[PDB]
Design a protein around this ligand. Structure first.
Ligand SMILES: Oc1ccc(CNCc2cccs2)cc1
Length: 283
């Protein structure tokens, strides 16, 4: 079926939970043996969210190459994304090592450091120009260059220096700051505006390594971001845009990382975002 009318049909029939459970039943299951080794327990935020072995990002280290991060490679759309958990106190250095080694330009953050009165990730970037951060375990230095605070999101320019070679790179930090503590946003308008700002920066483009996107677990909000992006891109590429099937795209992405889209409300919000976005792209 088309999307917008399949949408109204699920709303009128109240069957979002049944649609979402079908997806869960049909999703791929692949091994995640490296994630479950005992030496990696303090490298995982949640015991039930692990990268698959076949698609995990490896750190260029011989001691321990493990990080909870996955490469989502979308062949027809010609987009790649790295989806990862919010860094932990003992993995902030690994996180920036990955950014460096994979040649990423942008980092997309979809959560606040504290939500619901608890910490959802470490404070992994510097908050003042004159107070830079050094990660001694991976030999990197990180500096805040500028910060632009808007009503729904903040964009930061950061400098990452490989202290071993003295090479430097500019990294863009795109921080969506208004996702509600419970549920999903009522309108997709500010989320779509945020996506378009990431796009306009060049961070999603083939001349750079994959964008790094995270929330707390790296599967819910993060899944919504890459699912909406890929579906809108496919609608631009194909002769028949109504042929884009959002459930099939999601099942394809779940071949690369488990659990993408965590609730039926997130599924519905993804439909809403793609539907509204497809009208703005044209007309
Ligand atoms: O330092 C840390 C200590 C524990 C955790 C949480 N680990 C959850 C897991 C339990 C079993 C497998 S994975 C994170 C950091």
């Amino acid at each position: 079926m088309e999307m917008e009318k399949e949408f109204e049909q699920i709303d009128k029939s109240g069957s979002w939970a049944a649609i979402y459970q079908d997806i869960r039943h049909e999703a791929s299951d692949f091994p995640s043996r490296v994630a479950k080794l005992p030496k990696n327990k303090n490298r995982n935020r949640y015991r039930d969210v692990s990268p698959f072995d076949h698609s995990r990002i490896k750190l260029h280290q011989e001691d321990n190459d493990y990080i909870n991060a996955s490469l989502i490679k979308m062949e027809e759309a010609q987009r790649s994304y790295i989806l990862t958990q919010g860094p932990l106190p003992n993995t902030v250095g690994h996180f920036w090592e990955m950014v460096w080694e994979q040649k990423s330009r942008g980092v997309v953050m979809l959560n606040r450091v504290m939500e619901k009165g608890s910490l959802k990730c470490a404070q992994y970037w510097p908050q003042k120009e004159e107070k830079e951060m050094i990660f001694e375990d991976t030999n990197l230095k990180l500096t805040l260059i500028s910060e632009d605070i808007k009503s729904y999101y903040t964009v930061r320019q950061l400098e990452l220096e490989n202290l071993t070679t003295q090479e430097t790179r500019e990294i863009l930090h795109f921080h969506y700051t208004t996702w509600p503590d419970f549920g999903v946003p009522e309108s997709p308008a500010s989320f779509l505006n945020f996506l378009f700002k990431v796009r306009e920066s060049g961070s999603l483009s083939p001349e750079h390594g994959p964008v790094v996107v995270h929330c707390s677990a790296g599967i819910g909000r993060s899944g919504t971001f890459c699912l909406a992006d890929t579906c809108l891109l496919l609608m631009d590429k194909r002769k028949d845009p109504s042929s884009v099937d959002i459930k099939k795209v999601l099942l394809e992405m779940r071949k690369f990382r488990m659990g993408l889209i965590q609730t039926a409300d997130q599924l519905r919000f993804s439909y809403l975002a793609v539907i509204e976005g497809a009208k703005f792209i044209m007309g």
